[PDB]
């Protein structure tokens, strides 16, 4: 794969002001005469930690539910997807990556 850019989130603040922090989008109506449904998976949404990100099945917009720390949760890897109104493959998937942005809130400790 490729080193594609992250969406960022900074430590300890309430991150629900950015939601939805990303979205997928596509359309099928003029090439295929169909409408659409959207999906995500990955770390935060189908691998641990769990329940971090949420999205509506109609829209493709992705939200973050938790207050974060790069000292706890350094990086996240998701993939979006989209299907037609009966469940069919139609559009290529891509990854999406999220980071935690880090400020000095802690003191160095031995190994």
């Amino acid at each position: 794969a490729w080193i594609t850019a992250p969406v960022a989130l900074r430590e300890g603040e309430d991150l629900s002001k950015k939601n939805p922090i990303a979205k997928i989008h596509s359309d099928l109506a003029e090439e295929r005469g169909l409408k659409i449904t959207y999906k995500y998976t990955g770390k935060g949404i189908t691998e641990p930690p769990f329940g971090i990100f949420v999205f509506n099945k109609d829209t493709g917009e992705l939200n973050v539910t938790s207050i974060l720390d790069r000292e706890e949760t350094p990086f996240f890897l998701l993939t979006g997807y989209a299907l037609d109104a009966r469940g069919n493959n139609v559009e290529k998937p891509l990854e999406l990556r999220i980071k935690v942005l880090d400020i000095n809130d802690n003191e160095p400790v031995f190994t």
Binding site: T37, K57, D58, A85, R86, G87
Partner: protein, 218 residues
């Protein structure tokens, strides 16, 4: 069970749980030929697909964009369970699941008219002065379609009551305490209507409530 039966709300979020189906085998356990695998094998209506079922626990959750009481009320699915992990020579058994839809108070009481003019004689009680009516697209006779009315303005000293005539939900305005023409000749009023049922998404306080303007001549 022979037949499993469940009940879900209308117009709730996708991924809501329906109910779980449960089965067993009497072969020796931790084998392949006890390894259970569950499925939906058909829907009414036949297409598109509205529900999904967890292959290794039998839990049904919703996958349509909407399930709406005010168009469809029931869904009967055929379901199955297979052993062998669902490998082609496992043994399999068919059964039935009924899903009901349950009506939420999503619709409003709706006027065909919002301004009204009337008269009454002074000194009179037990006389009616204005009838008002509404549709509501919720299901008949339920708490979601039933109506309640209120006098919002212009009844300073208590001349007026409003009550509901149930059989059409018609709000009947009457004089309960008499007027006196030798104090006032005209008054201007407001009323309102709302369900007996609560409403969501901040609708309770006023936005579930619809109003009509009234003038009463003495």
């Amino acid at each position: 069970e022979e037949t499993y039966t469940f009940t879900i709300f209308e117009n709730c979020r996708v991924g809501t749980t329906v109910g779980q189906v449960c089965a067993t085998d009497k072969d020796e356990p931790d084998t392949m030929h006890t390894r259970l695998k569950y499925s939906i094998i058909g829907q009414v209506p036949p297409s598109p697909t509205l529900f999904s079922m967890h292959p290794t626990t039998g839990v049904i959750t919703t996958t349509s964009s909407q399930l709406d009481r005010e168009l469809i009320d029931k869904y009967q699915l055929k379901i199955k369970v297979q052993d062998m992990d669902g490998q082609y020579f496992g043994l399999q058994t068919t059964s039935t699941c009924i899903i009901n839809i349950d009506d939420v108070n999503d619709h409003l009481p709706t006027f065909t008219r919002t301004s009204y003019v009337t008269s009454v004689e002074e000194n009179t009680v037990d006389v009616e002065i204005l009838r008002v009516t509404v549709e509501d697209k919720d299901l008949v006779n339920t708490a979601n379609w039933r109506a309640n009315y209120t006098i919002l303005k212009g009844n300073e000293n208590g001349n007026f009551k409003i009550v509901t005539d149930a059989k059409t939900n018609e709000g009947v305005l009457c004089v309960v305490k008499p007027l006196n023409y030798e104090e006032k000749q005209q008054m201007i009023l407001q009323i309102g209507v709302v369900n007996e049922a609560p409403f969501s998404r901040e609708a309770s306080p006023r936005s579930a409530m619809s109003t009509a303007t009234v003038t009463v001549n003495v």
